């Protein structure tokens, strides 16, 4: 209804390649783009995609509080929204993961009646999971800002993953172009010693920011973090991963209520692969007899009766791709399902009808051959069950 | 050295749009693609990008254990890696977030000496942060699988975010094509009642999976989850977000050791930075435009970039090659095999650009692409972009 919109998007962490297709498409469609990114290749890429970009990084300064910068960053965006423009804000990683001005700008825009949306992106923690070869689900994940972790005395779980952002600027909220001496780092190390012990591993993690670089995945003990030359290596893009100390046992009452015992595996017994960063992690066999038996079944395998093969058309595939990749086409479609579906070339009557309704079932039926036996979407992990 | 590679990538959650540019480029370059995705439009899109794709979803079956399915999915990928092929596995969301077979296949490939890598993608949790307008940093975030949360009695923190995946299939291991009756959902609700109380908010979250759908962001009390009509809305793609019950106080020792005080004038524990979490019970109104915010905005008119600001100053040739290294996996592989041979064959690079590319060091590339001023010098300060209770 009201003219003007704010869409905030991410670039991901690794230069260019970790931007989403939809983030790119909004950057291209925007009347004005405001960006804060860490590497010049991503900045240059963004400038080739829109003619009206502004670098938000220029609003930082030595001894200027970050809060004032953030207020300024968000106001620049919201000013253009108020004039009736389609504005896009672009931030490093995921634009709402450890980011102030994005949330501020969106909330102001939203409260004043403008269309406001954040699109998700790939965060440093997403990269961490990928590079450290860990799954947040096994055995759970605690994520904190390092200074917050200390100041508010946030609880750890020695049985779950712990991830700490901003380990290289403990207790420091000022800006400097030279960065800071991380003088209060020792206060974090003391907390980690207390919680985990001096010999427990800490993984210093830095995701590759350029496509050709390797990530930093350096295991240290908590005690090694006291060494000057090791502590020196922690900076503004450093994140700490601390693996579990031990494995949590199963609760008998829950086993009973969930009907899992008629037995349950030992707490030490694992599904391959085991977390390689955990201390005293045993070797897990990737090819047990049950695995070999399942692999033997591949030779005679046919799709089950209830499997739904894709059965769509170029015309339908094109329109669904266009709706995902063309914000203007999506907006037209959302404004009038029927008028949009009428104007799409080469659709079958079923495809047209499904697009007219817009319901997920109708579109699925149009694109997937549903067998008789069917008429259960793949959550793709098992835990200790 | 050894022929063959495995790259596992994600599609993100929302159909097509939430795939990363690098995920797409690897799907296109692969000799063989194996995929497991939820929606047919993403499936169709993948099939237009590579001519040799296999749907891994066909290896599920009624009454066949998920572990066996996962062993099979992994082996189909690794078999092609061992034939010397560049193999790409594709999974919904982030391919290592609540996914078994990706980690298995990568670990096997890596242990047998093949190139193995996971590329991150947008997870259901990433979507949740974006759609619910919360930041995991404020006030921390605990993320669990719902059945694991119950079975291993995982700790909640009433002062931090809690996110629970798989709340629509509590205690269910099996596979069925028609989905499952979430009969043990009451076991979860009891635990949430114990931890938070009957009147505490639980946000039922479903990210939009097609570009035109709206997300489900439905707030219920814990008690409301006991109603049959409410409970039945929770399905296989449902996630719960449970907001903080209260705000945690600062401790004096850390305040002192971090030297964050002249006198007792740290903000009160509830004096939040705008905006406040709208899902928290008894969330106070936070003023977006305090006097200090207005003073900051007033400085915009006379603003110029600081001396030490580094304007972009690159070339078409350099932005093109850096873009190509990000979007062309074959070009990246060549560049990594021999920095100098690659750099010297790139057309139209300046001497500095060529030299920076020959070295490959981030600083050399940065200095080739940005005008680093005298003011900045070379100490030999990048924008981490949140503050907590420090200001
Ligand atoms: N290349 C990298 N590797 C590891 N952690 C990183 C990183 N870049 C940023 N971070 C983490 O993020 C903090 C900056 S806060 C901004 C994070 C960004 N919005 C995101 O989605 O990740 C850093 O202090 C660090 O903890
Ligand atoms: N559209 C959606 N909205 C909210 N949560 C979702 C979702 N799709 C999947 N999930 C969550 O993820 C679980 C499946 S497990 C696979 C998750 C996927 N790899 C990811 O990166 O998120 C579901 O039980 C649900 O908790």
Numbering used by the authors:
A (entry chain A): 7 to 268, 271 to 383, 397 to 406
B (entry chain B): 7 to 386, 397 to 407
Which lines from the publication concern this structure?
While chemical methylation of an amide bond uses a strong base to generate the imidate, OphA, the precursor protein of the fungal peptide macrocycle omphalotin A, self-hypermethylates amides at pH 7 using S-adenosyl methionine (SAM) as cofactor. Omphalotin A derives from the C terminus of the OphA protein, and it is the OphA protein that methylates its own C terminus using S-adenosyl methionine (SAM). The structure of OphA reveals a complex catenane-like arrangement in which the peptide substrate is clamped with its amide nitrogen aligned for nucleophilic attack on the methyl group of SAM. Here, we report the structure of the peptide amide methyltransferase OphA including complexes with cofactor [SAM and S-adenosyl homocysteine (SAH)], cofactor analog, substrate, and product.
